Amino acid sequence: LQEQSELMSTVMNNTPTTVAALAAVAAASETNGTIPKPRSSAQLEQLLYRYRAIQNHPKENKLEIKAIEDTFRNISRDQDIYETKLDTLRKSIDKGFQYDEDLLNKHLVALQLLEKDTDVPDYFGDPDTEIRISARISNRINELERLPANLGTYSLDDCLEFITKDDLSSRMDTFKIKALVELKSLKLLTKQKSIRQKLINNVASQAHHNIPYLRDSPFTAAAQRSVQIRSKVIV
Amino acid sequence: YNNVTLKNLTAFQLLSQRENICELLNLVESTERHNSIINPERQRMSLEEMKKMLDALK
């Protein structure tokens, strides 16, 4: 039940000693399914730091201190292993390789595009695959709609304008317009679809009076000629 | 498949027009469409039927 978010909620509510998660087998082990080895850089580790620093006062009501300290031992051991491996890795380097430039370009651009979830070109119907497109657009809409409205730039070209304490520079909004062109272009999609239908179903709906090589064929001219035959008058 | 279109007529005429030019250059065989319709054993079997009809009618 997200104990690694329950610690964050108890920290941000500023009352963590008053509850202390009721560390028994019935409560502290029901959310764990040891502790699950936190994932973040420090956002789930500083919480463990503060949690141990608050639980130094009771020291016996909470039996889960030992598994947390075992994970501190694991973190210290992994850190010492990485420091020894970084000491050896800087000694295992060849004296000459002369890494190529125009492949370093491609690795940097490819890593940068693979960070922020966009498609990388290689250079090295069916409503199953219709929903898998219409579920990537809701991703982008509900990711752009969580940006703060007070978003603003600071380009490297405001130094040539000498902005005072209150001067209102003229390149402050080169990202918030761009973060609304996407968010409103991804909501006007089923309007340009309905305009493209009215375009194609009135250009292709003639198809034999505008295109020259179709209205000059034998069979099209014969069909258009034969539909215009006025019915025979008996007597 | 009961009806025809402009695409069907154009494809039929283009196919039948390219099959005729490929017999001058002899880059297509077309021996199967020849011999499945000639079929000389069927021809002599039919001639034997005509001969038996001559015998039965005389």
């Binding site: 651009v109 940068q112 960070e115 070109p121 | 001058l24 250059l25 880059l27």
Partner: peptide, 26 residues
């Protein structure tokens, strides 16, 4: 982990003789 310019991503990114041999003959 600095983003790259968009205008740089957009910047880095036997059938012959079979007729002739039959056209020479006929």
């Amino acid at each position: 982990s600095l983003p790259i310019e968009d205008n740089y991503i957009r910047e880095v990114v036997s059938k012959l003789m079979e007729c002739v041999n039959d056209a020479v003959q006929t």
